[PDB]
Each structure stands twice: as structure tokens, then as C-alpha cells.
Design a protein around this ligand. Structure first.
Ligand SMILES: Cc1nc(-c2ccc(C(=O)O)s2)cs1
Length: 282
């Protein structure tokens, strides 16, 4: 593990804040003009978190195509992810329209609806089988089919129905419920088991549209999810797995959405997740 030597070096020297700042400095900056139009102000949860115009997901509605969502395309890994913010009360319909239009099979949620006593996300899925949700603005119906509650995460089967065409699809909702209010998990074990559960479902496979990944802003925890998945996939593909540089992969992903990995602690956690996940393969 050359990276595990890089890990001990940065850890022993306590240089995480320093590595993190060099990533911040080197990160791409692309226009986000559509996000900043006044008519889109209530479609953004945070005024400083915007999709780049070049990678933004466009809704197929003539009126206003805008959602705070980015397509991450990792060419070498053959993996694509949509990263988005936790939906707002007024964007729950747009969220499900995007899931429908992009042919996504899975939604990965890395936050609780309430954290630190404030709402981080609208309740955008049904809590009971017999109480379905209708999104009048986008003509979609959503039903809870089943719910499997485990210690660290919940998996839900949902049926999404296009009321316009009466087509239905099954969507899997993967809800990681134990990310702490402050900092990062002590151990990456439950995060890796969650990531392997998503992979096992087929939600990340090229047969389907890209997986939708969100937390509150869609950059921090969401960033760690995609970064760990892509790094482990590249390790599997590569003739020289050690050639895998987490910092380079992160900078590539930052071409597609700003601010992925919010803290030096999330960066350290990403290294730890990848190092431990590589041990799982062996
Ligand atoms: C067959 C596989 N090898 C690895 C790695 C071996 C050595 C590494 C390194 O030194 O970084 S990664 C992951 S899966």
C-alpha cells in the first residue's frame, strides 16, 4: 500500500489541512451561470454550492430545466454518478423527474432529514405503504413497496409511476443513517459494507442510468462515497494498482462538481476507506 505509506506520512506529520488546501488551490473553476439566474434562486439550498454549466443535469421541461445536480463521468472507471443536493420542499417533484429522465435504478442518501436541530432535506419518499406521494408539478406517483431497517442503513424498494404514460419502475433507496452530526465515522467498516450493498444491487452498473447520490449540499459525504467507489474500481481494473492516486482522482471529479470533500477529516476518512476496502479484495 504505497498510499498507506503516504497515509502514515501525512498522519505522523499532521499535514491533512495542508494536503487539503493544495487540493482546494488546484481545483477547477468553471462557470455556473444557469445556477445564478434569479429565477433559480429558490432551486438552490446553498448560495455557494452550484453545478457547473458544462456538467449540470437538465430537466426535460420547457419552462425551467434547472436542478442543482451534476453528472460526474469517470471515463477510465466506466462509472457515472449524479451528485445533487437534498431536495427542497419545492424541488421534490424535480428530483423524481430527474430520477425518471436519467433512468437511475438507485438513490443513495447519506444524511438524516434533521441534523443539528435543522432540516437538511425534505421528506421526499413515503413513510407508509398505504400513503403514496403524488407530485402534481411533474406528474409522478411514488409508492413505498418495502423497507428493510438495519443498524447502520435502511434499504427501501419504491415504485415510481409516470402518470402521463402509466410506465412504472422500481427504484432502490439506500439510506445511510449513522453518519455522525459532527466529524466522520471512527471506522470505515460500516461505510464500506454500505458501499458493497449498493454495488451488489446493480444500481452502479452500466445497464442503468447513473446512481443519484446526495447529502445536504451534495459535495461532502456524497464526494467521499463516489471517491471511494471510483478508487476501488480503478484498483481492480489496473495492471499497476499502486499507480492509483486519491488526490488525482479527487481533482478529476472536481472538474464536474465543485467542493467535493468539504473537510481535511473527510479526505483522511476517504484514504482510510480506500486502504481498508483494498484489504477486502485480499
Ligand atoms: C491485487 C490488488 N492489489 C492492490 C494493491 C496492492 C498494492 C497497492 C499499493 O502499494 O498501493 S494497491 C489492491 S488489489
Amino acid at each position: 500500500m504505497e498510499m498507506e505509506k503516504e497515509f502514515e506520512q501525512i498522519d505522523k506529520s499532521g499535514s491533512w489541512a495542508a494536503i487539503y488546501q493544495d487540493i482546494r488551490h488546484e481545483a477547477s473553476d468553471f462557470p455556473s451561470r444557469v445556477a445564478k439566474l434569479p429565477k433559480n434562486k429558490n432551486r438552490n439550498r446553498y448560495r455557494d454550492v452550484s453545478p457547473f454549466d458544462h456538467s449540470r443535469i437538465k430537466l426535460h421541461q420547457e419552462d425551467n430545466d434547472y436542478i442543482n445536480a451534476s453528472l460526474i463521468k469517470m471515463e477510465e472507471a466506466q462509472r457515472s454518478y449524479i451528485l445533487t443536493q437534498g431536495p427542497l420542499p419545492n424541488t421534490v417533484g424535480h428530483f423524481w423527474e430527474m430520477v425518471w429522465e436519467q433512468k437511475s435504478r438507485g438513490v443513495v442518501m447519506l444524511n438524516r432529514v434533521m441534523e443539528k436541530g435543522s432540516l437538511k432535506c425534505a421528506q421526499y419518499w413515503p413513510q407508509k405503504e398505504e400513503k403514496e406521494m403524488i407530485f402534481e408539478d411533474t406528474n409522478l406517483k411514488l409508492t413505498l413497496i418495502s423497507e428493510d431497517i438495519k443498524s447502520y442503513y435502511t434499504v427501501r424498494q419504491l415504485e415510481l409511476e409516470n402518470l402521463t404514460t402509466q410506465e412504472t419502475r422500481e427504484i432502490l433507496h439506500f439510506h445511510y443513517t449513522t453518519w455522525p452530526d459532527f466529524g466522520v465515522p471512527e471506522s470505515p467498516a460500516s461505510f464500506l459494507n454500505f458501499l458493497f450493498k449498493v454495488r451488489e444491487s446493480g444500481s452502479l452498473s452500466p445497464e442503468h442510468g447513473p446512481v443519484v447520490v446526495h447529502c445536504s449540499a451534495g459535495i461532502g459525504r456524497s464526494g467521499t462515497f463516489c471517491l471511494a467507489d471510483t478508487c476501488l474500481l480503478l484498483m481492480d481494473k489496473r495492471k499497476d494498482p499502486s499507480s492509483v492516486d486519491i488526490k488525482k482522482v479527487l481533482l478529476e471529479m472536481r472538474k464536474f462538481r465543485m467542493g467535493l470533500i468539504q473537510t481535511a477529516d473527510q479526505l483522511r476518512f476517504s484514504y482510510l476507506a480506500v486502504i481498508e476496502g483494498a484489504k477486502f479484495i485480499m
